Design a protein around this ligand. Structure first.
Ligand SMILES: Nc1ncnc2c1ncn2[C@@H]1O[C@@H](COP(=O)(O)OP(=O)(O)O)[C@@H](O)[C@H]1O
Ligand SMILES: Nc1ncnc2c1ncn2[C@@H]1O[C@@H](COP(=O)(O)OP(=O)(O)O)[C@H](O)[C@H]1O
Ligand SMILES: Nc1ncnc2c1ncn2[C@@H]1O[C@H](COP(=O)(O)OP(=O)(O)O)[C@@H](O)[C@H]1O
Ligand SMILES: Nc1ncnc2c1ncn2[C@@H]1O[C@H](COP(=O)(O)OP(=O)(O)O)[C@H](O)[C@@H]1O
Ligand code: BEF
Ligand code: BEF
Ligand code: BEF
Ligand code: BEF
Lengths: 44, 533, 247, 513, 533
């Protein structure tokens, strides 16, 4: 394990996990306001 | 984070650090046992977590009765016991050399001499040293059978501590004592044939040993022989209290009060066996006690009865007054006799005590050890024990050998000689050989220097130097005289030691350092929280 | 000659305390190995302050990622060196400091002395920095001026393999032009950048453009006050205070 | 989310490799300093018993270490494995691994699951050639004994007890001789007592039971005809059990006499069996030894189960069942029986000339109460090597010969494949090549220049050779008598590149607390 | 309960325990600085509580930059600095001997030799040893003035660590460098005349020193001389920013906007002083900065202006281009001139840097030290610093003396000789004398054995032995060759050391052990809770 640097409070995600965490983090802010647009859309 | 494991709560003292933790503690057990050697030495008071006090100079005593957490230490502590078991003395000698020798080891590493190369060294020196020890000889296997000097030699062995100063009376008391149970130790019959009773009185000087076992018993009834005159005895070990057949029997009286016949039956079934003993020939002795009734039968049939004779005693009772520890008297008396000596009973120090004034075939004996404090006697028993075991085994291996450092430097001289051929064969390993000597030399210095403070004779420098200059020549001669502070021949001086002893003092040591230098690392897995506290 | 008797090692800590950094350092130059070449990727850096950084400059990436092991730290400066010296390969030099230290590992492991490897390596260093010429004397190229076909292609490769990969055309030439002009007709020289690049957070990469003149971060006086741009202009580097005459 | 519920950690790929490859070598560097007499022993302290073990035995050295890592604990299995199957070399069975996978690690810079294909196929070529170089025979008991000693020696070396190497190598080869091939090593028990010195550890052709004769009886015996009784010398009673009630008061008047008599049938049944001494599984009542002592019959109350048979299979006298049912035809033909006088308690003895063999290799070593253990487990490491040669006549030379022949052979194949799988091969060799290299570290010779030196000689000679630890000449192992059994050095090779496989396939993991 | 005080939180490590805590740590600082001696030695990376990294081999560096709680230790750590101040090298030598010598002390107590008796011993040996050091001589006070070998000698001094391997270029660079500021150190003018600028680039090899001070300045205005050709200069230190008379003056305009005349007055009062400078003779340099206006006057009057010349630089500027640091120009120019050399400005490593190509009377100089890591240079500065101070003082005391152990064993040989007369006068004190030698011998062993591991030449045994057998004869000859692993004469080999240095390496040491053995007890009064943590 590791040793790498540096903990604690300092971490890093690698390849897959990030490319995912990034996409999830985007669909998050996205999917919230995905209802808004369009005349059929509502307010919040 | 790493883990890096290994495991938590575990630590790897590795390599040189291992070399440290290894060596760095072995000689730790030095400053602890340094005091013990040399008649001019002093003792140590040990306390514990149970609020108790021990003030004795024995090493197995100050090493077993210690708390230590460094392997090597505990390891040498372990080597301390090895001695105390197989021989009376030399436990202290085993450590001081063990350590000092190991001290000389962590030293060759200042020169960069591989440990395996020092095992190789010490190995040659070790055997090459014991060699010359063998060469000394001087055994009194043959007449003059008296070999009184050898007995004197054990006393020389026990010199120092507390007992040695008084005498010179102990060797005579031990010597004689062993001489009775001498033939006994050869047989594989332990030293337990000699019993030691603490009835403190007067001074450790007044203490003495009476011929004819003493016992703390009776005589548990007023209408009983206070003393038995010439009367014969019987050593027995049958059941007197349970009084039950060795069967699963459950008397069930289907009638009205048929027990009145059974409760009398067994109450008489003992009278039958009781009557064979009445049958011969007088006093009775038996391990298992004798209930109020049966014992009160003898009392009226003129037979002094002695109950609760500990296993040790019944065997001991067999040893003195030559008797057979036979229970069954349904055959009596084929190969079943019990000789005896007047058995007058005498109290000592306000304590009741029956001892036999007259007896035969004394292959065992009790020895009282009066004193001044319970603490004192506890330390006399050890001193008698140590010196009493020495003499014991010496009678099993007649090989004698001069004490006082003579034996040591004789080993040291003979060593350095081959050794100073040791470099040549082959070079570096030689220093290890040469070094080995330094140990056996050093123990002698510790003996006078750091331990033989007074009389004012203590110089590490001069004394040792005197022996080497004046010791190569005296081959097994020129010992030391830590009383006057001179180099005088022990042999004319009664400084005689056991071959078995001064042999093992090295065998052990040598064997110890070897496996220790083999240490590269050492690991542990914690068991108690912390506990740095 | 050598035989059985000699002669142990006084301490062993030396050995392992050397195999240690060899690792701690390796790891750094290992997890950074993904951002070399056109098919390399950048990394997000959350500052101890809070700021976010996404970049391919491994000499900035290494600095951003907090490090503990004092030796791993060393690795950082040698990456930041290549930047102050040349200005490129900030990442490649690290992946080198690895391989070397990583094989000096293999060496020590086979009874090869460290110090013997130190200068032993340094010998291959001076031979490498020399072989670089015997390979460009020569067969390839060493052009310095009068030819943009290469200077641009230096940035085209250089521009290439960064976030600006797609928009480099404009970037590549621009850089070359913005540099070659500060020493043109002046001959070759060590050159320090007086060029000023200021960025407005508005727009996309391509929006950025060279200015045929000067730009200033400070805005006008705005209606403070009454502005730009005085028709034909005549500037002034006014200095000192301008308030009511005060001593 | 779920999963099954954290806290659970998860390591995958790159690091999971290092942390495993580097994770194993972690064990390997410490483990290695135990090869050739220029070898080290490590201390091992146990929390509970608070007593420490000192010896050098790869199996024990690791079996006594609490280690968190799966990849490490894994190795700790390899050791504890070869120790079982083979018996010796366990110290190194990991060494070639940690190196092997450290090789695989570097090679991993390149798919892993294929690297296993090489190490199992290429180190198979090595496994093969090593059989070729093997030297069989002879099968004449005249020659055997001279080889078995050479084996026991090469194994017994580098262990605290090496000092009198011969003294032990003899101990081993003897106990192994008795019981043809191939018999379990469970009948010959290694008993140990703390007795002054080293080398006082002889081999015994009888048994050394703890128990000491009851009462004041003789300590020796002539023309011993012992008796193997089972039932205790006490009045019997059904196991189902029953109760006897003295309904009749006069019934006891006869019951009492029934007591003394119902055991006097023990004496009559003893003299009649011609037996001279006795000993029983279950205990005997004080009402018995009494009769025994006067007669001169010897009393030996209580004996352990496995000891009841040792005393038996020593004289082949059949384990008697209940007294008085014992035929004088069944008796113990013991040559002698004595009470050795150790400090404190002294064990009894059952000497036998054949014998019989139920050897008891009792070892003393007073020097250090914790050296006996340290030693009596090395005697074993000897024993189990002196046996493998009986079961497997094959033998091979050590000192680095083993690896040398392989890495040499393997070496060529790697340069032939000119395949990526092929590089795999080359490492499988360089891993072996590492073993002798490491064997040099300890002796003191420079490694690098010592293998190359050693590899040339295999070519000039092939494959006899090796690297001398101490004696000069860098002489061939067949000359210096430095050899160990061939199948052992097989299991070692295979068994390593095995864990090297499984452990090189993991890739990713999941650990909970 | 008792109290028994004394006081809580305080402890009395007394007597032998004091003897322990005393000795038992002095050599603690051994295993720390053991690595530094010997060209084959290695460096140490030091971290701190501020998360910083230092990887340098200097001893004052690894002793000052350490955390230690055992008096003796800190005490020797203290002795480490004493050196670094008074001389460049020998701090490491001072400790190793200091410790080792003290190690030999805790050893004579195995023989029982009173400490005061060992102070007495070491005392004789100490001076008797320095004696022979004096006897060697070999100083190049007289021509051949070149004394290049002595300069070579400092380089020999700086051998090892990091810098020594590269060259052999440093001695030439230092030698020359000192030779400029040579006459300067004799005057009491410190080494600060030489400045070292870190502009890391290339490899510690490419680093070089240019004649003619370099400065990081300007040239703070575009309409300014990028380079000054042949032009003269002026070193000044007057106020340009405050622009206020040295008086308690508070201009109070009782009128309506009279300030308009005052705010112009002082705004011109500077123009007056500004005009004298315009008056001569061209460039201006001044410690105190020059505000935007005044500095922008020079720019238009064709006078390159250099502001913020640190105090060090103004003094340095005086040293090169021989100028006078005079402010007042109301008298100019009596005893006020400022020679100069072309002052072309050149950037290095992406950093602006103005240096003068041409100049005169160079009694000072800057030397750039490129490198590979900021960590590297930090350690080159120390190496240059150490070796640069050695050469410095050597030019103040011409007394040379051969290095490599020759000087050491020469002391050791000469010592043991008087010493082995030492017992005779008078006996036990002799061993102390004899022992002293063992130290100076031991430092040499540490130098190759425990430190000179490779090339594979390291044997504690052989090497030392070679010198004694082959060193008594070579009186100041036969040193060592830790490169090839042989005993070769240093003198033909350029192994030259400073007399002042190798003298103090003992003066210190000797003076240290003395006051330490005087220690009977040592006490402390806690300051922080616990703090066992
Ligand atoms: N056309 C190319 N194809 C593949 N790799 C290239 C190409 N051009 C450049 N590279 C690689 O990328 C460069 C190194 O860039 P570096 O400063 O180390 O980090 P980065 O790749 O992120 O710019 C080259 O020197 C080279 O090895
Ligand atoms: N006398 C020798 N000379 C050279 N190599 C030897 C010699 N004896 C053993 N070896 C090699 O090194 C040994 C290491 O000991 P090993 O059996 O693996 O574990 P342990 O020594 O702990 O019982 C090998 O078994 C062997 O091939
Ligand atoms: N070129 C050399 N070869 C061998 N020994 C040297 C050489 N130069 C110096 N020495 C000696 O080796 C030792 C260590 O170097 P030293 O000048 O003491 O550095 P420092 O004192 O700052 O640690 C000294 O005894 C020294 O004079
Ligand atoms: N009067 C004496 N003069 C000189 N040496 C003596 C004298 N008496 C005894 N010695 C010796 O001094 C040594 C040290 O005693 P020692 O055997 O160590 O006691 P222990 O082993 O029980 O600690 C010898 O073994 C021996 O007893
Ligand atoms: F220390 Be002794 F053996 F009593
Ligand atoms: F590092 Be590359 F040039 F972006
Ligand atoms: F392999 Be050994 F016997 F420990
Ligand atoms: F310690 Be010195 F400066 F090498």
């Amino acid at each position: 394990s590791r040793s790498d640097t540096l903990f604690l409070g300092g971490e890093k995600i690698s390849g897959d996990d990030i490319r995912n965490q990034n996409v999830l983090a985007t669909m998050a802010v996205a999917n919230v306001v995905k209802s808004s647009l369009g005349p059929v859309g509502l307010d919040k | 984070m790493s883990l890096q494991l290994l495991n938590p709560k575990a630590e790897s003292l590795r390599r040189d650090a291992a070399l440290k933790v290894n060596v760095t503690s072995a000689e730790g057990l030095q400053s602890v046992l340094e005091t013990n050697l040399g008649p001019k030495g002093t003792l140590k008071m040990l306390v514990d977590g149970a609020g108790n006090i021990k003030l004795t100079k024995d090493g197995k005593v100050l090493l077993t009765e210690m708390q230590i957490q460094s392997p090597t230490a505990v390891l040498i502590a372990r080597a301390a016991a090895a001695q105390d078991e197989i021989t009376g003395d030399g436990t202290t000698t085993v450590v001081c050399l063990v350590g000092e020798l190991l001290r000389q080891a962590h030293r060759f590493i200042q020169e960069g001499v591989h440990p395996r190369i020092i095992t190789d060294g010490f190995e040659i020196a070790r055997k090459e040293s014991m060699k010359f020890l063998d060469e000394f000889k001087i055994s009194k296997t043959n007449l003059s059978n008296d070999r009184e000097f050898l007995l004197q030699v054990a006393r020389s062995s026990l010199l120092t501590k507390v007992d040695a100063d008084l005498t010179e009376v102990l060797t005579p008391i031990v010597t004689d004592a062993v001489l009775s149970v001498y033939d006994a130790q050869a047989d594989n019959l332990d030293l337990h044939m000699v019993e030691i009773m603490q009835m403190q009185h007067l001074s450790p000087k007044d203490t003495t040993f009476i011929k004819g076992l003493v016992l703390d018993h009776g005589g548990r009834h007023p209408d009983m022989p206070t003393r038995v005159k010439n009367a014969y005895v019987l050593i027995l070990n049958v059941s007197l209290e349970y009084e039950k057949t060795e069967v699963n029997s459950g008397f069930f009286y289907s009638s009205a009060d048929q027990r009145d016949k059974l409760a009398a039956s067994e109450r008489k079934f003992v009278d039958a066996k009781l009557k064979k003993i009445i049958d011969l020939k007088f006093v009775i002795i038996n391990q298992k006690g004798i209930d109020p009734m049966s014992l009160d039968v003898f009392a009226k049939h003129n037979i002094l009865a002695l109950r609760r004779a500990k296993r040790r005693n019944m065997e001991r009772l067999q040893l003195v007054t030559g008797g057979e520890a036979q229970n069954s008297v349904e055959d009596l008396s084929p190969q079943i006799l019990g000789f005896s000596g007047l058995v007058y009973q005498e109290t000592i120090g306000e304590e009741k005590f029956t001892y036999v004034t007259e007896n035969t075939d004394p292959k065992s004996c009790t020895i009282l050890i009066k004193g001044s404090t319970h603490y004192a006697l506890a330390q006399t028993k050890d001193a008698v024990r140590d010196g009493l075991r020495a003499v014991a085994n010496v009678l099993k291996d007649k090989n004698i050998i001069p004490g006082a450092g003579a034996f040591y430097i004789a080993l040291s001289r003979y060593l350095r000689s081959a050794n100073m051929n040791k470099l040549g064969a082959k070079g570096k390993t030689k220093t290890g050989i040469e070094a080995f000597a330094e140990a056996l030399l050093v123990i002698p210095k510790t003996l006078v220097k750091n331990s033989g403070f007074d009389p004012l004779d203590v110089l590490a420098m001069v004394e040792d130097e005197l022996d080497d200059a004046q010791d190569s020549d005296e081959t097994r001669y020129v010992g030391v005289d830590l009383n006057i502070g001179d180099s005088c021949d022990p042999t004319i001086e009664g400084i005689w030691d056991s071959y078995r002893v001064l042999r093992n003092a090295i065998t052990g040591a040598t064997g110890i350092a070897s496996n220790l230098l083999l240490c590269d690392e050492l690991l542990r897995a914690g068991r108690s929280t912390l506990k740095e506290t | 000659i050598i035989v059985k008797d000699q002669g142990n090692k006084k301490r062993q800590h030396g050995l392992e305390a050397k195999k240690s950094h060899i690792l701690a350092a390796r790891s750094v130059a290992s997890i950074i190995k993904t951002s070399l070449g056109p098919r390399g990727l950048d990394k997000i850096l959350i500052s101890p302050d809070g700021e976010i950084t996404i970049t391919n400059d491994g000499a900035t990436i290494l600095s951003q990622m907090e490090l503990d092991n004092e030796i791993a730290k060393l690795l950082v400066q040698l990456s930041k060196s290549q930047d102050d010296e040349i200005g490129d390969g900030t990442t490649g030099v690290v992946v080198l400091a690895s391989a070397l230290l990583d094989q000096a590992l293999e060496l020590i492991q086979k009874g090869i002395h460290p110090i013997k490897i130190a200068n032993g390596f340094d010998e291959a260093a001076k031979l490498a920095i020399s072989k670089l010429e015997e390979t460009c004397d020569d067969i390839s190229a060493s052009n310095d001026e009068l030819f943009r076909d290469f200077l641009l292609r230096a940035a085209k490769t250089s521009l290439g393999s960064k976030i600006v990969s797609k928009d480099h055309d404009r970037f590549a030439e621009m850089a070359v032009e913005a540099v070659i002009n500060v020493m043109d007709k002046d001959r070759k020289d060590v050159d320090f950048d007086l060029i000023k690049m200021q960025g407005r957070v508005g727009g996309s990469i391509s929006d950025s453009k060279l200015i045929n003149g000067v730009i200033l971060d400070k805005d006008f006086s705005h209606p403070q006050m009454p502005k730009e741009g005085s028709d034909g202009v005549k500037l002034a580097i006014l200095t000192c205070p301008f308030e009511p005459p005060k001593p | 989310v779920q999963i099954f519920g954290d806290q659970v950690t998860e390591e995958r790929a790159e690091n999971a490799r290092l942390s495993a490859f580097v994770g194993a070598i972690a064990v390997g560097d410490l483990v290695k300093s135990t090869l050739g007499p220029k070898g080290m022993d490590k201390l091992l302290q146990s929390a509970s018993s608070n007593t420490c073990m000192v010896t050098n035995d790869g199996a024990t050295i690791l079996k006594s270490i609490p280690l968190d890592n799966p990849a490490a604990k894994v190795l700790v299995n390899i050791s504890k494995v070869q120790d079982d199957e083979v018996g010796d070399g366990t110290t190194s069975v990991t060494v070639l691994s940690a190196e092997l996978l450290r090789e695989a690690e570097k090679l991993i810079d390149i798919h892993p699951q294929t690297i296993i294909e090489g190490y199992r196929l290429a180190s198979a070529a090595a496994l093969d050639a090593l059989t070729k170089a093997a030297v069989d025979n002879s099968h004449d008991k005249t020659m055997f004994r001279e080889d078995l000693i050479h084996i026991a020696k090469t194994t017994l070396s580098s262990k605290i007890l090496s000092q009198d190497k011969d003294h032990f190598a003899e101990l081993a080869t003897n106990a192994i001789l008795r019981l043809k091939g191939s018999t379990n090593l469970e009948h010959i028990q290694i008993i140990k007592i703390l007795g002054g010195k080293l080398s006082d550890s002889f081999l015994d052709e009888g048994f050394i039971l703890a128990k000491k004769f009851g009462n004041n009886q003789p300590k020796r015996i002539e023309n011993a005809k012992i008796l193997i009784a089972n039932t205790t010398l006490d009045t019997d009673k059904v196991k189902i059990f029953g109760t006897k009630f003295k309904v009749d008061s006069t019934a006891k008047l006869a019951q009492l006499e029934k007591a003394e008599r119902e055991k006097m049938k023990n004496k009559i049944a003893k003299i009649s069996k011609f037996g001279i001494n006795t000993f029983i599984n279950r205990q005997l009542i004080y009402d018995y030894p009494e009769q025994l002592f006067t007669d001169l019959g010897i009393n030996s109350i209580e004996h352990a189960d496995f000891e009841g048979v040792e005393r038996l299979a020593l004289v082949t006298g059949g384990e008697v069942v209940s007294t008085f049912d014992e035929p004088s035809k069944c008796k113990l033909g013991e040559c002698d029986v004595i009470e050795e006088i150790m400090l404190g308690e002294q064990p009894f003895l059952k000497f036998s000339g054949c014998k019989a063999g139920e050897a008891c290799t009792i070892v003393l070593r007073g020097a250090t109460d914790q050296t006996l253990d340290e030693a009596e487990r090395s005697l074993h490491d000897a024993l189990s090597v002196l046996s493998q040669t009986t079961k497997e006549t094959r033998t091979v030379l050590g000192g680095g010969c083993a690896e040398m022949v392989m890495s040499k052979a393997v070496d060529t194949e790697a340069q032939n494949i000119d395949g990526k799988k092929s590089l795999a091969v080359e490492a499988f060799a360089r891993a072996l090549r590492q073993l002798p290299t490491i064997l040099a570290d300890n002796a003191g010779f420079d490694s690098s220049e010592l293998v190359s030196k050693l590899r040339s000689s295999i070519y000039n000679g092939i494959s006899t050779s090796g690297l001398d630890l101490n004696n000069g000449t860098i002489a061939d192992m067949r000359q210096l008598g430095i050899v160990e059994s061939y199948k052992l050095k097989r299991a070692v090779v295979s068994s390593a590149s095995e864990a090297a496989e499984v452990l090189l396939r993991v890739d990713n993991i999941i650990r909970a607390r």
